Design a protein around this ligand. Structure first.
Ligand SMILES: CN1[C@H]2CC[C@@H]1[C@@H](C(=O)O)[C@@H](OC(=O)c1ccccc1)C2
Lengths: 204, 211
């Protein structure tokens, strides 16, 4: 199975640099053109760059020439995107992609002078129960329940962008009422950009 | 500019034909039309590349070719697993340009009433002098939904933030709506309500500082 995994995306001030990487597997990597595709929130898909099987041919979109560089190792199965002099418009999820096969999940690149803000975690007690991950920047946030023991009955909603500028999401569990008094329910929130790792005891 | 239709529907076993159009006028084989599929909760995947070449794992019910200057993606006997968003990309010697995307919906999934749960502000958030109401909507199909908030019996617009309905892993949709208030505003009303409208029916949930 073809698999592409992006990494290296983070938050940088306007003018900074960042380097993206993509680990390829499941196919002969050196026999296919490789592409970088991005999507800003709300806008559509925007092709960024592509590269030959050996690097002898490279193409870039206009808004990116002179600031980005695409390259590939043909001895480690890796695609790279070096991004210099980053601009606010470069904020987008970046995808590792081929013409045929599944793209990667993508890594978020945020170009903004706003500082990193850790979330607040509040319990949503029952009278379903959950927890609220309030006011954080940038994305993303991971949520697990009782150290990832349970996987069914739990739902983590996509985050919402507040009028403020910050994000918030929630994650809720559905359990029997008889389980409320015996069993524990701890939701595990981890926001890596802010080094925030919180476990909250959700309790009636 | 790459132009695609907005939406298409079909029943399982029906046929659908996607049209990709170039504002320049015509699409040739040198535009290397690439069709990309996006299901919710799944990665983008390239189905067709260079007009007609299929990815190894795509079934042959998908086909691409050029018809009358337009690039076309046809699904012969569409499946429920084909309910997704389809993007078209054209090559102009030096770059790709994507289209807006065409949503293909496969009919047959039965109606599902939304499940609404409204959470009042925590005791832990009220102690930090903040107040947020969380309205969670899940397990509804189709994805069209309307969320209205009520303080006491009057509507509220300021402070409402609502997510776009997104599909869960069981193909049903889900959404969330947040109402950020001050603690003084929260205790100054007898109640707050989240009323969710789905297919002409309204589900209402109410919280109060009483409890
Ligand atoms: C300049 N190249 C680049 C961009 C246009 C053209 C084309 C090409 O070279 O054929 C592309 O590749 C494909 O469309 C393709 C590749 C593998 C499998 C199926 C399709 C790669």
């Amino acid at each position: 199975e073809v698999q592409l995994v992006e990494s290296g995306g983070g938050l940088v001030q306007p003018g900074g640099s960042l380097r993206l990487s993509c680990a390829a597997s499941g196919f002969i990597f050196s026999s296919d053109w490789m592409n970088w595709v991005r999507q800003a929130p709300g806008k559509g898909l925007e092709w960024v760059a592509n590269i030959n099987q050996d690097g002898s041919e490279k193409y870039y979109v206009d808004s990116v020439k002179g600031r980005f560089t695409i390259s590939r190792d043909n001895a480690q199965n890796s695609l790279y995107l070096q991004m210099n002099s980053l601009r606010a418009e470069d904020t987008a999820v970046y995808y590792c992609a081929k013409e045929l096969g599944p793209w990667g999940q993508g890594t978020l690149v945020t170009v903004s002078s706003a500082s990193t803000k850790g979330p607040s975690v509040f319990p949503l007690a029952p009278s379903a129960l959950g927890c609220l991950v309030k006011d954080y920047f940038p994305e993303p946030v991971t949520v697990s329940w009782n150290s990832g023991a349970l996987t069914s009955g739990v739902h983590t909603f996509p985050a919402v962008l507040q009028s403020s500028g910050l994000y918030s999401l929630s994650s809720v569990v559905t359990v029997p009422s008889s389980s409320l008094g015996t069993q524990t329910y701890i939701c595990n929130v981890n926001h890596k950009p802010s080094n925030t790792k919180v476990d909250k005891k959700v309790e009636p | 500019v790459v132009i695609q239709e907005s939406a298409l529907t079909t029943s399982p076993g029906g046929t659908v034909i996607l049209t990709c159009r170039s504002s320049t006028g015509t699409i040739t084989t040198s535009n290397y039309a690439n069709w990309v599929q996006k299901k919710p909760n799944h990665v983008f995947t390239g189905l067709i590349g260079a007009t007609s070449i299929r990815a190894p794992g795509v079934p042959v019910r998908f086909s691409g070719f050029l018809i009358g200057g337009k690039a076309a993606l046809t699904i012969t006997g569409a499946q429920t697993e084909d309910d997704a968003m389809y993007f078209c990309a054209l090559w102009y010697n030096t770059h790709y340009v994507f289209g807006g995307g065409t949503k293909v919906t496969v009919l047959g999934q039965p109606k599902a009433a939304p499940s609404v749960t409204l959470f009042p502000p925590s005791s832990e958030e009220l102690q930090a002098n903040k107040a947020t109401l969380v309205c969670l909507i899940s397990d509804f199909y189709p994805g069209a939904v309307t969320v209205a908030w009520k303080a006491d019996s009057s509507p509220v617009k300021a402070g409402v933030e609502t997510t776009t309905p997104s599909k869960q892993s069981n193909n049903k949709y889900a959404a969330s709506s947040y109402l950020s208030l001050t603690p003084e505003q929260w205790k100054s009303h007898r109640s707050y309500s989240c009323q969710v409208t789905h297919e002409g029916s309204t589900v209402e949930k109410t919280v109060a500082p009483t409890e």
